[PDB]
Design an enzyme around this catalytic site. Structure first.
Site: not given
Ligand SMILES: Cc1ncc(C[n+]2csc(CCOP(=O)(O)OP(=O)(O)O)c2C)c(N)n1
Ligand SMILES: [Cl-]
Ligand SMILES: Cc1ncc(C[n+]2csc(CCOP(=O)(O)OP(=O)(O)O)c2C)c(N)n1
Ligand SMILES: [Cl-]
Ligand SMILES: [K+]
Ligand SMILES: [K+]
Ligand SMILES: [K+]
Ligand SMILES: [K+]
Ligand SMILES: [Mn+2]
Ligand SMILES: [Mn+2]
Lengths: 370, 329, 329, 370
Positions: C63, C133
């Protein structure tokens, strides 16, 4: 001879940019092939049968629970759910290599760590339902597990925040001198956040006994890794921070186990960070371990059937008791904001109690405790 | 009252507070950018030599890391005193503070907490700090349940308040008015003592108007009270708020019920500043007692300027003129 | 009034706004986490296929980077529409917003600016979003001179307001009430149109009490007005604030001079929430007209809970009971 | 053969952590030795005399200005000052390799870039004094220079914030298709901030024509690099992001020039980021270039004397005119907060005007315009 404090280096008299090697990256460590066969006998950990069966039963029991709660989410019985599919071996294999009191930070895909540390099905369920048995008091979204008794720090939704925290906890452990490592799980997506950079660098310069465990499954929601980074995954970043790094086959519980056991051993002895990048898919850890068990004579079709049946029943017993429990008293929305409750917060608590005396027929009071 | 004292300016009283904490708490550590050699405002001089390089140490240049790191230390139960070099540079850590530190205890059902964390930071204007060496960020933090925000007016106040932050079982932000670091000394007890958090102090009793401020601005309103008495025959009650959140609503309301008039002053910009929270609350509790509108004499709604600082600050003439109008309403 | 309309829910009206902007501005780009395939709330469906992968694209998961990146695009004069996936995750970018975006023009003497930047973000409670959220961060941003904060109540309002943000020559944060994304559709003009920023809308005229809110909470106070009229014989003026800063002080004060009573409501926690800024300002301008204390019916001063959401929100019964007491004062 | 989307790699059947090489790091590129001698003739850029003299005169004129303003700060005539000592060659050598319209982001040590682009002494001075000639309107601390005409984005005090911004500007330039690079200067200290990680990664995945120029002088205030990182400086980080990287001798204007010229050429043609780490001291760029000039017959003692005298006079003429100018009208504290002035901000402006009519004798009004 160069006299710069920032870097230890020779001179060079010709202009030469350093090119990344991404086409042939850090190779992927593997112990057993896709048929559950040991590739290199000297790398076999020769885990005893009881322990290998516990890995298998933890992975499958997790997978059973995933199936049921995923369906629960689909019917809106719970509001949210993250599954563990493809991640069962990274979590159960790494957890098995830790001491039970090693402190764990993670996020959404670490339920297997808790399963291995024998967290009750009842408590997984209580959290997803926010019922009276939840020690989290129903305050967070489902799958935001925490267990103080099992040294598993409560998950929070903002990605990567636990990485510099895990470093601080490792530093405090170093000073306390009682031989403990911290492990910190995160995905490849979360590794793009500024907090990952913060944690990796602090661990190296402050000399912390921490394992960084990155799960690389190729996707962050809809974002392929081609949009996430252009170096050789996360493992190639480790060396640039001064961190010892390895990449492993996340579908191979033995590879994950071996790399975690050795990272733990050296982190605690040398007070230095280790980075493990486990490659997974968004060929499966359960079926690979199943093939291994069969070749040992340690599992068969009949035991597999009996175990699917018994673990389905254990999960369904928990699931139904979890659904039938009341939710916590609505007063618990106000406690633990501070350790003590400020006089003005107590006033807001009393105004709610007053409100519910007049307007209570309009609130879902019959599902909540007291 | 407090045993042996010696004259200390604000930075020395901070060092004294930090020394006393390390001496009595074997888990306590202090860390941040440039703290090892004594800090850029000299608040950590001598502590590393005295307590060891594993207890008083430099971090990499990364504010979100410093705060994340401090939270993790506090998660194990150890005292973590983090420094952010200027309050203007606390913002990279805002997510670690607001989403993590403030919510740590609540969201875990008290299974985990980072109550043993304190973040200290130089704060407020300095004559020439311009945009990024002058800020008073306290209103940003006042809207985040789960943290405490505390601001001292003097050396005696600073040591007692900082010791309370450090020992308080909630994550605390302690803002040190950097213009007072080398200003006049006062007598400060050598041994540890505490000043309660969430308690305002009536430093001068009055019957016509309540003045409220915190930090350096307390000295400004003290002077305003003196100008009012001399020029206008007006008797001011002067109040140092001290703790921004949770704030001491009772002391402020009890004073306003007596006087019927309130002027709140702070260096931070008017819009969204913490004076609006105090004003709207006193309006709710003391509506029937109000003789005149609650007045807010604040910085302008602009970034903090370099060459125009003299015209920006809510100085004693600004406060006095508002008080005069309020008295005449 | 506006040419051909079609029924759109809030997410479709956002897509329509973003489509119209890309069609008419060759420099405009849209970027953030997961926007390429259409976004997690479907606000960017079809835009990449229509405008090209160099104009509608995914960033790494960071972000502070997204906002820093958006500022740099806007520094060259190009329109940058950044998405932050949930308002709860805007905090890593807080330093880029507050210290950089908001101050870019001032600190350069207008040599440089990032006025062509807009940050959009899902906002507000959703029934089950819990801590991360559900948040309404607008009061954090209201204390930062140099940015605009804008929040729509409906699809028609959202498209007109978002187009104004995008074309406004100041960095804007546009918060989209995520609970309305798939809620009822209304008629929304197909072609671009603008709704002025810093202008509140009196959506229903009344003579006894002014109700003020923004986002989803506008629908709550509309219902409160209906309950007041029916149960109490009370005539409410209902006002959608729309722009949080700079806010429309005149429309609110003119309404309160007529009614003599004000109730402000918002989902965000009471302490430090933006209702305190409105309350303290109206108290200053309409002191003599006030029949009763300005009432603030807000979320509690806690993090946003999962299972207790029904008991947390400032719902129509909470608002109605406060209005009843205020009418009886 | 591995089938993971996250990384391109072979399997390995033996457990092996990747060790950082910090003892023998990325070597330091050098063109001329400490005696101003070309080491490798094929690397000589053979810059023409006029250009090499402009490098020398820019570096020395900067150094003259530093001496005077540093003294001004010591006497409290200006409130703050950052010098350029040891950094003159990194800045003038890199600036010389850019096109004049290449956009520059930096921070505290980049005055040499402006000096090379012929920014008037009067305007350097106007900013430090906050006088009426300042286009910054006296709003920021001294040394916070910006020039729209010379494509030099206004400096801000928070470290590293300009790094992801510089990436966004490079992306916008790529789309605008008129063959421009962005350069972004930062110190090794600032490279620890989460924003550095953000900028480096965005540049690589979004394919931006940007040069990252890191000045590594071994210190961030009191913090030696041993407390700042444990990898091989900043240059070894570049490859982990997929960025082409080089380390250069910051005391060698020709090495800095060569690496910047080649990074610019390839950044603009290939739309990809380049990282230059210039090693400096907290053996000097001016004296090394002086030795080079003498060996060419291009400078002598008499010209050196005449130039020290003339540049001292130019700086003193500027310094004294800068001190004697009034400060801007105090009304300018309110403009440019937004592009337009909101009605409520104008009301605050009018209240100040009203205040100064009654209480004006108590404000320093005689130094300010109108
Ligand atoms: C700071 C922040 N930005 C965005 C999100 C929304 N979000 C929840 S899971 C995710 C993807 C995470 O990907 P990764 O770290 O590769 O883990 P995976 O889901 O593949 O196991 C996002 C963008 C969040 N929880 N926190
Ligand atoms: Cl999330
Ligand atoms: C975000 C932030 N934190 C801290 C500071 C205080 N500070 C000003 S310069 C500096 C050291 C910068 O070191 P480096 O980046 O190595 O540059 P150098 O001074 O050596 O040229 C610090 C910590 C700041 N301006 N911004
Ligand atoms: Cl600084
Ligand atoms: K987290
Ligand atoms: K504390
Ligand atoms: K805009
Ligand atoms: K900067
Ligand atoms: Mn992933
Ligand atoms: Mn440095």
């Amino acid at each position: 001879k160069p006299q710069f404090p920032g870097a230890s280096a020779e001179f060079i008299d010709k202009l030469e940019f350093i090119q990344p090697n991404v086409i042939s990256g850090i190779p992927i460590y593997r112990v057993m092939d896709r048929q559950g066969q040991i590739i290199n006998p000297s790398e076999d950990p020769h885990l005893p049968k009881e322990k290998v069966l516990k890995l298998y039963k933890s992975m499958t029991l997790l997978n059973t629970m995933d199936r049921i709660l995923y369906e629960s989410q689909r019917q809106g019985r719970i509001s949210f759910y993250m599954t563990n599919y493809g991640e069962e071996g990274t979590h159960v294999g790494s957890a098995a290599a830790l001491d039970n009191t090693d402190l764990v930070f993670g996020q959404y895909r670490e339920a297997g760590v808790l399963m291995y540390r024998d967290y009750p099905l009842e408590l997984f369920m209580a959290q997803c339902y926010g019922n009276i048995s939840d020690l989290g008091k129903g305050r967070q979204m489902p799958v935001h597990y925490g267990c103080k008794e099992r040294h598993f720090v409560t998950i929070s939704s903002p990605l990567a925040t636990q990485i510099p925290q895990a470093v601080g906890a490792a530093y405090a452990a170093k000073r306390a001198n009682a031989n403990r490592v911290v492990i910190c799980y995160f995905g490849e997506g979360a590794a793009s956040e500024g907090d990952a950079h913060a944690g990796f660098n602090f661990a190296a310069t402050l000399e912390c006994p921490i394992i960084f465990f990155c799960r690389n499954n190729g996707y962050a929601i809809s974002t392929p890794t081609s949009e996430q980074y252009r170096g050789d995954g996360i493992a190639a970043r480790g060396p640039g921070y001064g961190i010892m790094s390895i990449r492993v086959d996340g579908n191979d519980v033995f590879a994950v186990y071996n790399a975690t056991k050795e990272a733990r051993r050296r982190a605690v002895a040398e007070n230095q960070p280790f980075l493990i990048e486990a490659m997974t898919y968004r060929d499966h850890p359960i079926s690979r371990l199943r093939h291994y068990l069969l070749s040992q004579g340690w599992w068969d079709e009949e035991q597999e059937k009996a175990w699917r049946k018994q673990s389905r029943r254990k999960v369904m017993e928990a699931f139904e008791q979890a659904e039938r429990k009341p939710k916590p008293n609505p007063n618990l929305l106000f406690s633990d904001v501070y350790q003590e409750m400020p006089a003005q917060l107590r006033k807001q608590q009393e105004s709610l109690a007053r409100h519910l005396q007049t307007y209570g027929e309009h609130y879902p009071l019959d599902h909540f405790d007291k | 009252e407090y045993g042996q004292t010696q004259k200390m300016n604000l930075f020395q009283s901070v060092t004294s507070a930090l020394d006393n904490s390390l001496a009595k708490d074997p888990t306590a550590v202090i860390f941040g950018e440039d703290v090892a050699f004594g800090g850029v405002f000299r608040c950590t001089v001598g502590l590393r030599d005295k307590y060891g390089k594993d207890r008083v140490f430099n971090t990499p240049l990364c504010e979100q890391g410093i705060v994340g790191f401090g939270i993790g230390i506090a998660v194990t139960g150890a005292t973590a005193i983090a420094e952010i070099q200027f309050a203007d540079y606390i913002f990279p850590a805002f997510d670690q503070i607001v989403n993590e530190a403030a919510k740590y205890r609540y969201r875990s059902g008290d299974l985990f907490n980072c109550g043993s964390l304190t973040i200290r930071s130089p704060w407020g204007c300095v004559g020439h700090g311009a945009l990024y060496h002058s800020q008073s960020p306290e209103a940003f933090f006042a809207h985040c349940p789960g943290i405490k925000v505390v601001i001292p007016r003097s050396p005696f106040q600073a040591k007692g308040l900082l010791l309370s932050c450090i020992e308080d079982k909630n994550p605390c932000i302690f803002f040190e008015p950097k213009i007072l670091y080398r200003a006049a000394a006062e007598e400060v007890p050598i041994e540890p003592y505490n000043i309660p958090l969430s308690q305002a102090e009536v430093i001068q009793e009055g019957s016509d108007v309540t003045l409220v401020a915190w930090g350096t601005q307390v000295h400004v309103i003290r002077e305003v009270a003196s100008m009012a008495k001399e020029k206008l025959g007006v008797s001011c009650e002067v109040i140092d708020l001290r703790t921004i959140i949770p704030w001491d609503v009772d002391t402020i309301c009890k004073s306003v019920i007596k006087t019927g008039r309130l002027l709140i002053s702070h260096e931070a910009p008017l819009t969204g500043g913490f004076a609006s929270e105090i004003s709207s609350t006193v309006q709710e509790e003391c509506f029937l007692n109000l003789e005149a509108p609650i007045s807010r004499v604040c910085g302008y709604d602009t970034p903090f300027p370099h060459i125009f600082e003299p015209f920006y600050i809510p100085d004693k003439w600004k406060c006095y003129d508002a008080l005069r109008k309020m008295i005449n309403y």
